[PDB]
Amino acid sequence: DTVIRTHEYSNKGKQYISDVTGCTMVDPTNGPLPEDNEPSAYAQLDCVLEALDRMDEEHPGLFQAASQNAMETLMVTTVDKLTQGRQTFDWTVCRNQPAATALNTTITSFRLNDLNGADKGGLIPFCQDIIDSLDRPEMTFFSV
Partner RNA sequence: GAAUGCUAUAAUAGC
Partner RNA sequence: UAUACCUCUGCUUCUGCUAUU
Partner RNA sequence: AGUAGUAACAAGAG
Q: Which residues bind other proteins (CB under 8 A)?
A: 2-3, 5-6, 9-10, 13-14, 16, 18-21, 23, 25, 27-31, 39-41, 43, 45-50, 52-53, 63-64, 66-68, 71, 74-75, 80, 89, 119-121, 124, 127-128, 131-132, 134-135, 144
Q: How far apart are CA 122 and CA 125, in angstroms?
A: 6
| The entry of RNA, other proteins, none that residue 76 binds, CB within 5 to 8 Å by partner kind | none
Residues 6+ apart with CB under 8 A from 76: none
Q: How far is the CB of 77 from RNA (least distance, A)?
A: 10
CB of 125 to RNA, least distance (A): 21
Which residues from 82-101 bind RNA, rule CB under 7 A? 84-88, 95-96, 99
